[PDB]
Amino acid sequence: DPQDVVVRLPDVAVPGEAVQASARQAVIHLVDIAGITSSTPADYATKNLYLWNNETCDALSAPVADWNDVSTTPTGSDKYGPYWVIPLTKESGCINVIVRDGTNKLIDSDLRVSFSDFTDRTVSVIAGNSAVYDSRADAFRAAFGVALADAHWVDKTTLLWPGGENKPIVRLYYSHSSKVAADSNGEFSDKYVKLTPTTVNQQVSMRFPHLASYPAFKLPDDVNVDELLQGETVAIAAESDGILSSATQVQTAGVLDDTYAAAAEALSYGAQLTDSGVTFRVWAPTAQQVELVIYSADKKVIASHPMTRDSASGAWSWQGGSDLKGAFYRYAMTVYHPQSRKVEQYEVTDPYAHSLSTNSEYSQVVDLNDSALKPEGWDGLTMPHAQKTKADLAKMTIHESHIRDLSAWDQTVPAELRGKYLALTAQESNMVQHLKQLSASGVTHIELLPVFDLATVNEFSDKVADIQQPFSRLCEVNSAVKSSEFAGYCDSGSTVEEVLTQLKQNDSKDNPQVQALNTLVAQTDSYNWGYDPFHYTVPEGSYATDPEGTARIKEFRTMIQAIKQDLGMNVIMDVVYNHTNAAGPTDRTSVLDKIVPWYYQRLNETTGSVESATCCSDSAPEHRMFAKLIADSLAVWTTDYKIDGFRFDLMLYHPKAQILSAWERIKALNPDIYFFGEGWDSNQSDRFEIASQINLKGTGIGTFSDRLRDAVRGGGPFDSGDALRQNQGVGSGAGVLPNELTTLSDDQARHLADLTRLGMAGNLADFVLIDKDGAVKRGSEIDYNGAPGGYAADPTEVVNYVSKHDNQTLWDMISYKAAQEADLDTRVRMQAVSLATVMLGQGIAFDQQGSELLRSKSFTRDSYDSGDWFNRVDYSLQDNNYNVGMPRSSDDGSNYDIIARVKDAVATPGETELKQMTAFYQELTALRKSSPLFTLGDGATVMKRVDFRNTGADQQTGLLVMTIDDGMQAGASLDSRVDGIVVAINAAPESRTLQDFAGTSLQLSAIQQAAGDRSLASGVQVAADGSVTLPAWSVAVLELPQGESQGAGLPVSSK
Ligand SMILES: OC[C@H]1O[C@@H]2O[C@H]3[C@H](O)[C@@H](O)[C@@H](O[C@H]4[C@H](O)[C@@H](O)[C@@H](O[C@H]5[C@H](O)[C@@H](O)[C@@H](O[C@H]6[C@H](O)[C@@H](O)[C@@H](O[C@H]7[C@H](O)[C@@H](O)[C@@H](O[C@H]1[C@H](O)[C@H]2O)O[C@@H]7CO)O[C@@H]6CO)O[C@@H]5CO)O[C@@H]4CO)O[C@@H]3CO
Ligand SMILES: [Ca+2]
Ligand SMILES: [Ca+2]
Ligand SMILES: [Ca+2]
Ligand SMILES: [Ca+2]
Ligand SMILES: [Ca+2]
């Protein structure tokens, strides 16, 4: 346009340095951006430095501590600003400086100038900017150049940007093929669109609430968005004379959704077998070109096809022959990536990949419906356990397992199947037989730690060494071991497992050598929890016997079939849609962010950096096409892999709407699929309504409850040191069997009991009980570290547990917390008493694999990368993996002292204790399914039938007495055999007597009577008058036998 003012840099050269520091000197330039615009011949007399030596930075020579002293004025100055020559006592380390005008700080940040980072000790700064630049040119380019990314192109016509506020010139510059930069004439002569102030519309403010306060700008309706989005876009603002005020990069996810999502959601993606051949489709609305590259089995390029761009959706597609089934392929992208500001060229695997080559290097065309990829009978495989009604869901009893934890140690599993999906088919193995036994006794679901394609195990077996293989192999694959204090074992002739056993003998908090060797092992072994997504909709390859191609698909299904058909359990998958393993245009495992840069990752609103609050590269399920990827992914696991439910990792990083949307999609496929998740720390409520415990009330989406968990275990996940011992739980004798360090009061102990009773009744917001003080409280009125304790509408919305893959095992918590006088048999009963609160409760029951075997990780808190050694589960029942070396020092080193003090209080569990615990455990699961009363499903029904005795300020501490009504006041008789049930958990060292049921015909459950001396209720006495005497550390289930019709039962009181 003729009459538009040209935007340009200031009409002054890029500055050089004023002075360079000499020996025992540092130099600070203050680049006077304001006066570089000239006009006024400036005056730096009042500029001064505040300089002081502390213990972090002490290289100043004669610093002036007096803050009111303003006599450290500039050594000199030129048209670019003043500078200071600062004497030093050395040339190493750093100095502390505050840059002032009088006593006013020009930079609101204690500046740290480190000589390691700036070797010439000559740096530059600008007012209002905490960054330290190595040159005035650098600082100058920062103030008059592209920086940050706080502009947000959020729909077709709306750009949100702070930098544009009340500026005369606001424009969106764009360059197809290069970086927007000032030309040789200092001008920005790239094409642009003009922006005029406007008002944040109502649709945008709902979509982006965290941006609703941004100053809004309008683009004219004529704009050709497709052309701008194919390259770099930079928001630019300038004064009336045209001099640049600021320039920043533009986040485009919002406008991409506004432009393309409606059309793009109507399409299907990936390599899709059709009637006529194969249709390939990938979503890449900013890519300049996409080529489909076809590879031979040997990974030679055998064809390369420019794809067809759909202008309405921004998807690219290509249609080829059906002989491409089984072919390997990648997408060759030409695409601008804002992180590098380069038009990148790279090949990327398919985000909708359903088959992979070894280590996920190539995607592969697959038809998951092929009978060649199914075990025989697959299509008729049925759910062994119903999930239809709320009473169906409440029977869910989950065993959370890991592929290697199941079989890596089991010598009765054929060696080639250890650590593999197919180990579940070894019908005669100890592990499978043990699982069958647990299933027969009432474990109903296996929950699998990540079995989608994880990034953090190398699927090339030549690159991996495991502890069961020779130490020499570990040295071959891990070059760090040569330089390690274990180098002498390379020639030892023994395995790594043998060496680790040998290091046990003199392992201590002073010589943590077991952990030392294991940390090296962990870098190149086959072990990881796998919360590190590479491809969301392909099985992990390292768990297959053959990771090359489609083989893993059939082995995975053969496992799923064996679990459902031979073991009798439903299957839940852990899924991790809240982050990707990596982002950016360079990293091997960046898939999504290479194809559509800055759309699938959640970004910082100012810098454009990929956030890392999840751990890693946070994803954006609030963006429509990632929501679709998630839903499409779950559809494949649901239909093609026959998964019965899904557990979302860090689910509160997801919008409630997206989770509910996803759930409605899957329910249309299979109505009985169960969704649940875990979340505690989402700071994302400013961007959308998060999918949290509170916000999910009533929705039927389940959440892990940390309430009963913390109350029974004691303490919380962030405890360390002595707090691990002091913070006893209900299961470890809080307020009834104190250890030597604790100060738990009786009131504190009773508060834990309130949380536990509340959890056993399903942790409902509206459930009514008598609290620690004898006061009537709603579940939501019980405090939980500030939050409302009860939060659910129905007990199916709550998953109770006392042990999980993350944080310490239950046994290691009891070992930390148990009094010295609690002997080994008592600690085994503490374990069972702890699990009884879960198994006999109204919430869905969840437990870590191996709790029935007193599982220990040698006090490891976070064992995601601690290998076969610390995660071992011995299905030969020799020991519980306790006391096998100090845990990893990087995460548990500040616990070494309390560990050494508590560790050897009693003997390590052996075969006798393991069998007893398993009996206890199967007793509990059998009781859970012995009556519909345990699993009412419905919150209103729980509220009508479940009550508690032994409550209030004078309760007998540690005695939990729950009643479940099946008499006339409750409604119908849900159980033909009983008019009521009493659950009594005596988590205490004293025997206790109940008179609450005196004269009432109460009797002990037949299951526990049949267990005899082996029962958790061994020694329970029911007297003639109906008084019940409970042994120490006991669990008793009692019942009122039903007569010819529904009796009076155990009516809830109207409190
Ligand atoms: O002085 C010991 C001090 O050492 C270190 O502080 C550094 C600090 O990192 C630098 O920023 C700078 O401090 C400057 C301030 O930057 C400057 O603004 C001004 O501070 C004023 C404050 O804004 C104002 O609130 C008030 O300060 C009070 C304060 O409210 C009181 O609580 C008390 O301060 C004490 C601190 O609480 C205490 O932590 C310690 O401070 C350390 C600090 O840990 C460390 O980072 O001691 C002080 C008291 O000795 O009293 C002050 C008022 O006396 O008023 C001041 C205006 O004077 O000035 C300070 C420096 O004077 O440099 C210091 C090192 O000198
Ligand atoms: Ca320099
Ligand atoms: Ca993998
Ligand atoms: Ca590892
Ligand atoms: Ca944030
Ligand atoms: Ca009944």
The ligand placed nearest to the CA atom of residue 532 is 3
d(CA 171, CA 5): 11
Q: If DSSP codes are grouped into helix, strand and coil, which group holds residue 768?
A: strand
- Which of 611, 649, 923, 1039 is labelled catalytic? 649
Helices (H) and strands (E) in the chain, counts: 27, 49
What is each CA distance from 140 to 7, 36, 49, 75, in whole angstroms?
Answer: 17, 10, 21, 21
* Residue of minimum CA distance from atom 64 in ligand 1: 52
Residue bearing tokens 């202008």: 311
Residue bearing tokens 């934890």: 405
Report the separation in Å between the CA atom of 574 and the middle of ligand 1, taken as the mean of its atom positions. Answer: 50
Pocket test for ligand 1, best of 57, 64, 67, 130 (most atoms within 8 A of CB): 67
d(CA 390, CA 698): 12
d(CA 539, CA 552): 7
d(CA 112, CA 803): 45
Residue bearing tokens 């995975």: 556
d(CA 549, CA 327): 9
- Phi, psi (deg, nearest 5) at residue 587: -75, 145
What is each CA distance from 634 to 181, 541, 649, in whole angstroms?
Answer: 44, 19, 14
* Residue of minimum CA distance from atom 65 in ligand 1: 52
d(CA 480, CA 493): 19
The ligand placed nearest to the CA atom of residue 612 is 5
- CB 413, CB 429: distance < 8 Å: yes
Experimental structure resolution, Å: 2.0
d(CA 779, CA 757): 10
d(CA 1046, CA 975): 9
14: region left, alpha or beta (phi > 0 left; psi from -120 to 50 alpha): beta
DSSP 8-state secondary structure symbol assigned to residue 564: I
d(CA 236, CA 250): 10
- Phi, psi (deg, nearest 5) at residue 1029: -105, 125
The residue among 896, 820, 913, 805 whose CA lies nearest residue 859 is 896
User: Is the sign of the CA dihedral 829, 830, 832, 836 positive or negative?
Assistant: positive
- CB 103, CB 67: distance < 8 Å: yes
Q: If DSSP codes are grouped into helix, strand and coil, which group holds residue 647?
A: strand
Q: Where are the alpha helices (DSSP H) in 504-623?
A: 513-524, 551-561, 592-595
Can you list the positions of beta strands (E) in 838-902? 844-848
- Ligand 1 pocket (Cβ < 6 Å) reads 52, 65, 67, 98, 110
Tokens matching residue 545: 């016997």
- CB 789, CB 761: distance < 8 Å: no
The ligand placed nearest to the CA atom of residue 54 is 1
* Residue of minimum CA distance from atom 11 in ligand 1: 110
d(CA 658, CA 661): 5
Report the separation in Å between the CA atom of 610 and the middle of ligand 3, taken as the mean of its atom positions. Answer: 23
User: What residues sit around ligand 6, an ion, with C-beta below 5 angstroms?
Assistant: 966, 973, 975, 1042
Cβ-Cβ contacts under 8 Å for 101 (sequence gap 6 or more): 46, 47, 48
What is each CA distance from 618 to 249, 692, 871, in whole angstroms?
Answer: 20, 17, 28
Report the separation in Å between the CA atom of 1050 and the middle of ligand 6, taken as the mean of its atom positions. Answer: 11
The residue among 1035, 1004, 1037 whose CA lies nearest residue 1022 is 1004
Residue bearing tokens 């390997």: 328
The ligand placed nearest to the CA atom of residue 137 is 2
* Residue of minimum CA distance from atom 20 in ligand 1: 67
d(CA 835, CA 895): 25
- CB 705, CB 763: distance < 8 Å: yes
Report the separation in Å between the CA atom of 66 and the middle of ligand 1, taken as the mean of its atom positions. Answer: 11
d(CA 95, CA 115): 9
The residue among 647, 708, 672, 581 whose CA lies nearest residue 985 is 708
What is each CA distance from 663 to 406, 671, 762, 914, in whole angstroms?
Answer: 30, 10, 22, 40
Q: If DSSP codes are grouped into helix, strand and coil, which group holds residue 807?
A: coil
DSSP 8-state secondary structure symbol assigned to residue 350: -
DSSP 8-state secondary structure symbol assigned to residue 886: P
d(CA 52, CA 893): 35
The percent helix, strand, coil of the chain (3-state, each to 5) is 30, 25, 50
Which atom of ligand 1 is least distant from the CA of 105? 18
User: Residue 173 belongs to what H/E stretch?
Assistant: strand 169-175
Q: Where are the alpha helices (DSSP H) in 788-823?
A: 810-817
Tell me, yes or no, if 428 is annotated catalytic. no
What is the crossing angle of helices 656-669 and 624-639, to 10°? 30
Q: How many C-alpha atoms does 672 have within 13 Å on its Cβ side?
A: 19
- Phi, psi (deg, nearest 5) at residue 686: -70, -20
Report the separation in Å between the CA atom of 250 and the middle of ligand 5, taken as the mean of its atom positions. Answer: 18
Tokens matching residue 764: 């409902």
Tokens matching residue 402: 């890991």
What is each CA distance from 594 to 202, 337, 452, 618, in whole angstroms?
Answer: 32, 7, 20, 15
**Can you say how many angstroms the Cα of residue 171 is from the centroid of all Cα atoms in its chain?**
40
d(CA 521, CA 516): 9
Residue bearing tokens 């700064």: 125
User: Is the sign of the CA dihedral 128, 131, 133, 137 positive or negative?
Assistant: negative
Buried b / exposed e along 290-301 (16+ C-beta atoms within 10 A): bbbbbbeeeeee
254: region left, alpha or beta (phi > 0 left; psi from -120 to 50 alpha): alpha
Strands 992-994 vs 244-251: parallel, antiparallel or unpaired: unpaired
* Residue of minimum CA distance from atom 44 in ligand 1: 54
- CB 143, CB 133: distance < 8 Å: no
User: Is the sign of the CA dihedral 790, 795, 798, 803 positive or negative?
Assistant: positive
The residue among 371, 462, 461 whose CA lies nearest residue 420 is 461
DSSP 8-state secondary structure symbol assigned to residue 640: T
User: Is the sign of the CA dihedral 942, 945, 946, 952 positive or negative?
Assistant: positive
The ligand placed nearest to the CA atom of residue 55 is 1
d(CA 973, CA 968): 8
d(CA 613, CA 604): 11
Residue bearing tokens 């709407």: 657
Tokens matching residue 390: 């709320």
- Phi, psi (deg, nearest 5) at residue 421: -45, -40
Tokens matching residue 285: 């609305």
Tokens matching residue 330: 């990648």
DSSP 8-state secondary structure symbol assigned to residue 973: -
Tokens matching residue 524: 């190149």
Report the separation in Å between the CA atom of 468 and the middle of ligand 3, taken as the mean of its atom positions. Answer: 21
* Residue of minimum CA distance from atom 42 in ligand 1: 54
d(CA 129, CA 147): 12
* Residue of minimum CA distance from atom 43 in ligand 1: 54
Report the separation in Å between the CA atom of 476 and the middle of ligand 2, taken as the mean of its atom positions. Answer: 45
The residue among 251, 239, 236 whose CA lies nearest residue 170 is 236
DSSP 8-state secondary structure symbol assigned to residue 94: E
Report the separation in Å between the CA atom of 405 and the middle of ligand 3, taken as the mean of its atom positions. Answer: 17
What is each CA distance from 919 to 815, 872, 911, in whole angstroms?
Answer: 21, 21, 12
Q: Tell me how long the chain is.
A: 1055
Tell me, yes or no, if 797 is annotated catalytic. no
Which atom of ligand 1 is least distant from the CA of 67? 62
Cβ-Cβ contacts under 8 Å for 812 (sequence gap 6 or more): 856, 857, 858, 859, 860, 882
**Can you say how many angstroms the Cα of residue 485 is from the centroid of all Cα atoms in its chain?**
34
The approach used to solve this structure was: X-ray
* Residue of minimum CA distance from atom 56 in ligand 1: 67
Report the separation in Å between the CA atom of 1051 and the middle of ligand 6, taken as the mean of its atom positions. Answer: 12
Q: If DSSP codes are grouped into helix, strand and coil, which group holds residue 193?
A: strand
Q: What is the dihedral of CA 226, 230, 232, 235, to 10 degrees?
A: 10
Report the separation in Å between the CA atom of 683 and the middle of ligand 5, taken as the mean of its atom positions. Answer: 6
Tokens matching residue 202: 């109502």
Cβ-Cβ contacts under 8 Å for 107 (sequence gap 6 or more): 98, 99, 125, 127, 128, 129, 130
- CB 637, CB 605: distance < 8 Å: no
d(CA 97, CA 174): 40
User: Is the sign of the CA dihedral 997, 998, 1001, 1006 positive or negative?
Assistant: positive
- Which of 400, 605, 678, 754 is labelled catalytic? 678
Amino acid 249 reads: Q
- CB 667, CB 696: distance < 8 Å: no
Domains along the chain with CATH numbers: 1-139 (2.60.40.1110), 140-247 (2.60.40.1130), 248-366 (2.60.40.10), 367-946 (3.20.20.80), 947-1055 (2.60.40.1180)
User: Is the sign of the CA dihedral 397, 402, 403, 406 positive or negative?
Assistant: negative
* Residue of minimum CA distance from atom 55 in ligand 1: 67
d(CA 106, CA 126): 8
The ligand placed nearest to the CA atom of residue 103 is 1
Tokens matching residue 769: 């009980």
User: Is the sign of the CA dihedral 223, 227, 233, 239 positive or negative?
Assistant: negative
